[PDB]
Paper text:
Segmented negative strand RNA viruses of the arena-, bunya- and orthomyxovirus families uniquely carry out viral mRNA transcription by the cap-snatching mechanism. This involves cleavage of host mRNAs close to their capped 5′ end by an endonuclease (EN) domain located in the N-terminal region of the viral polymerase. The sNSV cap-snatching ENs belong to the PD-D/ExK superfamily of cation dependent nucleases. We find two different kinds of endonucleases, one with the characteristic catalytic histidine (His+) as in orthomyxovirus and bunyavirus, which have efficient endonuclease activity in isolation, and a second, without the histidine (His-) and conserved among arenaviruses which shows very poor activity in vitro.
Using a construct encompassing residues 1–174 from Lassa L protein we obtained three different crystal forms: one with no ions bound (crystal form X1), and two with one or two Mn2+ ions bound in the active site (crystal forms X2 and X3 respectively). The X2 data, solved by molecular replacement using the X1 structure, reached an ultra-high resolution of 1.09 Å, thus providing a highly accurate electron density map of the Lassa EN. Compared with the X1 form, the X2 and X3 forms show a 17 degree rotation between the helical bundle lobe (residues 4–49 and 149–167) and residues 50–148, with the hinge being at the base of helix αb. The Lassa X2 structure has the same conformation as X3.
Author numbering: 0 to 170
Amino acid sequence: GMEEDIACVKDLVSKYLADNERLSRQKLAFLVQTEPRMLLMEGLKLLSLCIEIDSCNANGCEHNSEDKSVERILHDHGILTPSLCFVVPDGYKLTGNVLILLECFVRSSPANFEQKYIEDFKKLEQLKEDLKTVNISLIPLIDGRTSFYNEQIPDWVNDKLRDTLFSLLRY
Ligand SMILES: [Mn+3]
């Protein structure tokens, strides 16, 4: 029944998630949960993290695991500005005065995909003028996906996880 299906998925994630230190904390955050709302929340966060790592790899960006704001990313390179909107990008790369910001997401339906694409696009665009005041050029990348498939977990395990997560919506 449902309990054994959850236990099975936990065992599969334990065995088959990539053995990668960057995933360890979120792997545990999922595995320790008992309540359906928390299995959903942490299971989705695990999948998002996996996709972000892949997206950053594919786009030549650093994954922003320290949750640096754009202001902090600039500060790390000795560039001070107090005037930026608060943005914590999924990934980034700052090389000289060229700032690449990467936003990543998964949405299945066209309406939801479009809503999130617009949201992330506008968020990055709103940095552009203020970045110019400190001589920074912005390359804003949006990796919007419809798929949860990723290099950090086998697709068959991904399917089992998502199916179980779907079933948990009943609670
Ligand atoms: Mn984002």
